[PDB]
Amino acid sequence: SGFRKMAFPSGKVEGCMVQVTCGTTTLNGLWLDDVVYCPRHVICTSEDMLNPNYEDLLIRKSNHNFLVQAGNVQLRVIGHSMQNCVLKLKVDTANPKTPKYKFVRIQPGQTFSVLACYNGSPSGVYQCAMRPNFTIKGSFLNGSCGSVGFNIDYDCVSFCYMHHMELPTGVHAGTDLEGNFYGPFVDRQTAQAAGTDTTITVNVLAWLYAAVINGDRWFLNRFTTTLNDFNLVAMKYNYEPLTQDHVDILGPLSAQTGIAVLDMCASLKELLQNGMNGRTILGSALLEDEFTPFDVVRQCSGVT
Amino acid sequence: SGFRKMAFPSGKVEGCMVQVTCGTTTLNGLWLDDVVYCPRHVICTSEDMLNPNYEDLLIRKSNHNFLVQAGNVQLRVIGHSMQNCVLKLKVDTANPKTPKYKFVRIQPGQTFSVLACYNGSPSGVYQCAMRPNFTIKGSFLNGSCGSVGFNIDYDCVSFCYMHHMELPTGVHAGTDLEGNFYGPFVDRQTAQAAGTDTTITVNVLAWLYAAVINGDRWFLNRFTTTLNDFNLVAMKYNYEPLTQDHVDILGPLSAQTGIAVLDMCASLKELLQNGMNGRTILGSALLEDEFTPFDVVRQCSGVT
Ligand SMILES: *CC(=O)N1CCN(Cc2cnc(Cc3ccccc3)s2)CC1
Ligand SMILES: *CC(=O)N1CCN(Cc2cnc(Cc3ccccc3)s2)CC1
Numbered sequence: 001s002g003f004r005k006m007a008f009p010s011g012k013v014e015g016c017m018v019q020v021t022c023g024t025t026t027l028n029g030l031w032l033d034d035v036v037y038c039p040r041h042v043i044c045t046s047e048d049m050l051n052p053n054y055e056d057l058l059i060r061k062s063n064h065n066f067l068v069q070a071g072n073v074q075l076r077v078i079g080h081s082m083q084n085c086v087l088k089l090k091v092d093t094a095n096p097k098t099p100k101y102k103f104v105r106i107q108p109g110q111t112f113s114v115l116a117c118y119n120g121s122p123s124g125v126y127q128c129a130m131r132p133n134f135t136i137k138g139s140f141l142n143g144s145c146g147s148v149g150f151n152i153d154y155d156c157v158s159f160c161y162m163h164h165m166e167l168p169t170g171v172h173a174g175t176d177l178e179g180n181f182y183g184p185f186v187d188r189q190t191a192q193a194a195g196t197d198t199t200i201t202v203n204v205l206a207w208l209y210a211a212v213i214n215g216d217r218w219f220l221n222r223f224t225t226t227l228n229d230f231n232l233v234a235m236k237y238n239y240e241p242l243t244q245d246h247v248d249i250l251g252p253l254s255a256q257t258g259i260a261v262l263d264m265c266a267s268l269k270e271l272l273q274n275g276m277n278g279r280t281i282l283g284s285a286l287l288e289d290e291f292t293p294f295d296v297v298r299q300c301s302g303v304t
Numbered sequence: 305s306g307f308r309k310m311a312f313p314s315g316k317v318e319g320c321m322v323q324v325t326c327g328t329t330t331l332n333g334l335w336l337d338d339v340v341y342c343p344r345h346v347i348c349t350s351e352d353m354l355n356p357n358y359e360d361l362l363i364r365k366s367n368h369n370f371l372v373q374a375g376n377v378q379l380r381v382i383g384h385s386m387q388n389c390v391l392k393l394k395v396d397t398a399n400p401k402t403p404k405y406k407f408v409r410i411q412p413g414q415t416f417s418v419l420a421c422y423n424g425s426p427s428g429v430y431q432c433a434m435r436p437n438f439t440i441k442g443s444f445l446n447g448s449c450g451s452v453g454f455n456i457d458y459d460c461v462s463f464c465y466m467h468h469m470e471l472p473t474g475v476h477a478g479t480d481l482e483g484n485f486y487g488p489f490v491d492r493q494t495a496q497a498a499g500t501d502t503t504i505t506v507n508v509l510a511w512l513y514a515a516v517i518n519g520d521r522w523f524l525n526r527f528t529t530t531l532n533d534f535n536l537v538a539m540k541y542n543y544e545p546l547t548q549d550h551v552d553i554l555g556p557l558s559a560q561t562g563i564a565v566l567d568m569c570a571s572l573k574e575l576l577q578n579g580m581n582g583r584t585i586l587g588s589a590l591l592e593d594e595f596t597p598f599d600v601v602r603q604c605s606g607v608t
Contacts (some may be wrong), residue, residue, distance in 0.1 A: 001474045004443035009419060009426035011315030068572035115313060121608035122313035125429060137587065139308035141606045170305045170519055215474055276589075278579070283441065285580075285589035302445045 003210045003282050007113035008152045010125040015097030019120030021067040026118045028146030036089040038146045039164045041187050049189040084179030100156040103177035108132045109200040112149040129290040132193040133169040134183025199239040199289050202246035206293040209253035211281045221275040223266035237272045249293045307514045311417035312456045314429040318403030323424030325371040331419045332450030342450045344466045345491050353493040358531040388483030390576040404460040407481035412436045413504040433594040437499040438487025439475040503543040503593050506550035513557035515585045527570035534569040543574045553597045568577040
């Protein structure tokens, strides 16, 4: 028993982290097979970041300008190309620690682990969610760009995020491993405001199910509701609308606990309307939304 | 910017996890050099756990009864011994992935990362703290025993915890790597109640400093207090007494923010007395106590 904000084991990803330096900028790269992926803003000076023309800046760079170091050994760059907002640096050596992998583009509400790195070296691992406004709330200092987000399915690492920037409000933006930003963000030091950071309703319900499985049951009430009634309340509280797809995904949790999804929605509705009254659920005084239904099943079952 | 509950990268520890089976019980083992460490209750049947005499049960076990598997390859056991509540299984092969390591016994209030494992395979990593009542609030299912807690200092892993049991209240108990339980707990299926789970005051103050460094400043007030006055309030709220040693340890955070430790104590005193009033600090609606002052400095500076 017990329920924790749990990250995937990071070993498979640690073996892929490298340092990439172009001129005076050093950030992280992801080395998979004979390609190193990194944010294209590694070619920028702090002056360039204000309004960079990446194609033009890249013309002044040659393979030998990209210094790639894996541990304390230098990798030989034999090609370079820009794919959207990432650079792909072809090296002459395949990463011998390359795990089975995929590049996936996640949907808002999906969680993933981040291996925060500096100078190609891992500093820590934590769990994030792609917010409904396409930002993530991470922990990233200067030098952390190029750190990646991922999920693991037994032995296959699905990379979903590469860190590129921090908005003026302290929230984070990045791309998938094809270099496409999540949301409307651009790799430019310009006015970029995030939209409404709504709560991931389906995740909150999954976490309420985890609470029941782990013994926290005070919030269970004698009520039920409908999808439409619940959604009127969810709209009022800046929660994402709950769909039949979300109800279906919560089916295994509903089956395990014997609590119908709509009954849990009515418990959530009362928590939104009445608050916690100074009480806690799974050690939290707020409704946690960074556990998906899959995460709750995975953690409550013990998938390795 | 941003502040997350961050675990150490788990790769160095993943390379040490093995499966240990004795009869019908399978749990995790830690393989360092040519020794595999595991909870001694691996020799128990569910019937034995009620009142086990470990020395007597161990007499009926031989080296060949301890099945140790690292990945899909079997390790040859050439010796076995009991040290307190752990068994040390000498194998004929040194773990080629053994990192630089130490065995440390932590004090309450200290944090560490846990690599939750099942059948010698890593499932996830999360951050814990040794509670003042010597329990930890983990996420452990049956089969997770033998999973370990650790800290890392650059390339040296300091192992501090091995998981042994869950109390009837859903909290966890275990040993250091010398096999001595933290607290008064015993490896027996018997009535073991935990003492008061008080809040780790020095950790809360460190986390308030992290909040200020990361932009959350609403809770800063116009007041100050003294150690004795603050401690009268801390006693009332089941917070650990703050000592001059704790004040000294908070010195670098005080210096970085320009907020004197006693002024932060006065902010904490008002938060205890008035509550949060529906507001949050670093995404939390409660005062977080599982970040030490060292953790805050480490994360806010980017140590790898
Ligand atoms: C996320 C990440 O690692 N990066 C993107 C943001 N930059 C910010 C900086 C750029 N240059 C720096 C050093 C400097 C400061 C002032 C004048 C000249 C150079 S920090 C870091 C990389
Ligand atoms: C923490 C950990 O991994 N362990 C300590 C607690 N045991 C509990 C169990 C013991 N035997 C089990 C299977 C069984 C159930 C009922 C009757 C006979 C066998 S679960 C697991 C290991």
